[PDB]
C-alpha cells in the first residue's frame, strides 16, 4: 500500500532552518512519471503548496517562497526532503508530503508533521478552577502555556460525559484553553470534581479541585 510519513523538528526558533523528511513506501521515485509535493496548512487556514519534485529531478517551487526553499530526494532510501531557511512565526503549520505522479497530483497524503516556530520558552500552564457564580456547569481554565499540547481530564478520566474541551488559542506567544463539565446538582458539590492537567513538555501534572465559591 502507498504510505507517507513526514518528520521534522517539532519546534524551531525564528531565523533557524526547517529540515523536513518524507519517508514513503508502496511507490518509487525511480518510476517514470512519479513525483512528490510538499504542502502546508496553518491551523484553520488555507493550504499552501510549497514545492514539487519529479523522478527526473525536475523541481518546482512556490514563487513567493522560492529563495527560501530547497526540495531534494534520496531515491534508493525512499525519502524526499524540504529545507526552509530563515523561518518565522508564519511558518508555523502542519507540513504534508503527498504522492504526486504526472496524471494525479496529490493522490496520497501523509498524516503530516506539526512545526511550531516560536521564541517562547517552555512554560507550564496556570490551571484555574471555574466554580459557578437542575444541572451545574463547572470549568477549568488552562492559561499561558508553551508549547502544545496539554492533556485535560476530569476525575482522572472517570468523568467524560457532558464535557467540552475547547481548542487552544494563542495570546502573546502562549496558549490558553478551557474545558467545561456539566453534571446534575445532586452530583456536585456533594461529590468531588477535579480537573487534571498534564503538560509533558514542562513535565508537570496539576490537579485542581472545583470548590464552591
Amino acid at each position: 500500500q502507498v504510505t507517507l510519513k513526514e518528520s521534522g523538528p517539532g519546534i524551531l526558533q525564528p531565523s533557524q532552518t526547517l529540515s523536513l523528511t518524507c519517508s514513503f513506501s508502496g511507490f518509487s521515485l525511480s518510476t517514470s512519471g512519479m513525483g512528490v509535493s510538499w504542502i502546508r496548512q496553518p491551523s484553520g487556514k488555507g493550504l499552501e503548496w510549497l514545492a514539487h519534485i519529479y523522478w527526473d529531478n525536475d523541481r518546482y517551487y512556490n514563487p513567493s517562497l522560492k529563495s527560501r526553499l530547497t526540495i531534494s530526494k534520496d531515491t534508493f532510501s525512499n525519502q524526499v526532503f524540504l529545507k526552509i531557511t530563515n523561518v518565522d512565526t508564519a511558518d508555523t503549520a502542519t507540513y504534508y508530503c503527498a504522492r504526486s505522479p504526472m496524471n494525479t497530483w496529490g493522490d496520497y497524503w501523509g498524516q503530516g508533521t506539526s512545526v511550531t516556530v516560536s521564541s517562547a520558552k517552555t512554560t507550564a500552564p496556570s490551571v484555574y478552577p471555574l466554580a459557578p457564580v437542575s444541572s451545574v456547569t463547572l470549568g477549568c481554565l488552562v492559561k499561558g502555556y508553551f508549547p502544545e499540547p496539554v492533556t485535560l481530564t476530569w476525575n482522572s478520566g472517570s468523568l467524560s460525559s457532558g464535557v467540552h474541551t475547547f481548542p487552544a488559542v494563542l495570546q502573546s506567544d502562549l496558549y490558553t484553553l478551557s474545558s467545561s463539565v456539566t453534571v446534575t446538582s445532586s452530583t456536585w458539590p456533594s461529590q468531588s470534581i477535579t480537573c487534571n492537567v498534564a503538560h509533558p513538555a514542562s513535565s508537570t501534572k496539576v490537579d485542581k479541585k472545583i470548590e464552591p465559591r
Binding site: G46, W105, V133, S178
Partner: protein, 218 residues
C-alpha cells in the same frame, strides 16, 4: 496566482440529500496539453486530505459513484448525491495547471438538525488567579445550533472588545450541536475598578440576546 473561489463556505445538509459545491478560478484551468488539472478533496479533523475527483470529473480509486465532478474552463462543481455521515468534513478544490498550485478555501459539509439555544454560563476570576495578579472572566455557550453566534462582553454596561479569546468546538458526533468558549482577560487592577461583568449571546433562537452577568462584590 490563480485564485480559487469556493462557495458556499458552510453547507448544512440532511443525510440522503444532494450537496453542490462550486469552485471558480480567476483564469482558465485548461493546460496547453489540453488537460484541466482541477481536483476535489475531502479532509476530516485530525486527518489528511483524500483525493476524490481528478481532472474535473474522474473518480479516484475507491471513491463512490455518488461523487461527481463537472464544469470546464473557470467554473467547476462537485455534486455529492445521497449524503452519508462519512461524507461530512471539509471539501476543497485544487488546481495544478499553473504554478503555484492553489486551493479553494474549503466548504464544511455539516449535518442539519433542529435549532437549539446555547446554555450560557459566566465565571468570575478564580481566587487563585487573583492571588497571582490576573483576572479572566469566562463564558461558555454550550450545545447550540446553528453554528452562527455572536458574543459581546460588557464591563459596567460598556462594550469591551480587546482581550477577548474565543474558541469553538467541531459539530458534536452524537447531538450535532456546537459549543463555544469566550474568555475576557483584564488586569487585576482593571477588574478591581469595575463592578458589572456581562456575557451577551446573540443567536437565531432568540430575538433578544441571552445575558449572563455578575457583580464583583455580589
Amino acid at each position: 496566482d490563480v485564485v480559487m473561489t469556493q462557495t458556499p463556505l458552510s453547507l448544512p445538509v440532511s443525510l440522503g440529500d444532494q450537496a453542490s459545491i462550486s469552485c471558480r478560478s480567476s483564469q482558465s484551468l485548461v493546460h496547453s496539453n489540453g488537460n484541466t488539472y482541477l481536483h476535489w478533496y475531502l479532509q476530516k479533523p485530525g486527518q489528511s486530505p483524500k483525493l476524490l475527483i481528478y481532472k474535473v470529473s474522474n473518480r479516484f480509486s475507491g471513491v463512490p459513484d455518488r461523487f461527481s465532478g463537472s464544469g470546464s474552463g473557470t467554473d467547476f462543481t462537485l455534486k455529492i448525491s445521497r449524503v452519508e455521515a462519512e461524507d461530512l468534513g471539509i471539501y476543497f478544490c485544487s488546481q495544478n495547471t499553473h504554478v503555484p498550485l492553489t486551493f479553494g478555501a474549503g466548504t464544511k459539509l455539516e449535518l442539519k438538525r433542529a435549532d437549539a439555544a446555547p446554555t450560557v454560563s459566566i465565571f468570575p476570576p478564580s481566587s487563585e488567579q487573583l492571588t497571582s495578579g490576573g483576572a479572566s472572566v469566562v463564558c461558555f455557550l454550550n450545545n447550540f445550533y446553528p453554528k452562527d453566534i455572536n458574543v459581546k462582553w460588557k464591563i459596567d454596561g460598556s462594550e469591551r472588545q480587546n482581550g477577548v479569546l474565543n474558541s469553538w468546538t467541531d459539530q458534536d458526533s452524537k447531538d450535532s450541536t456546537y459549543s463555544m468558549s469566550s474568555t475576557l482577560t483584564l488586569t487585576k487592577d482593571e477588574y478591581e475598578r469595575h463592578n458589572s461583568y456581562t456575557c451577551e449571546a446573540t443567536h437565531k433562537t432568540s430575538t433578544s440576546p441571552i445575558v449572563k452577568s455578575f457583580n464583583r462584590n455580589e
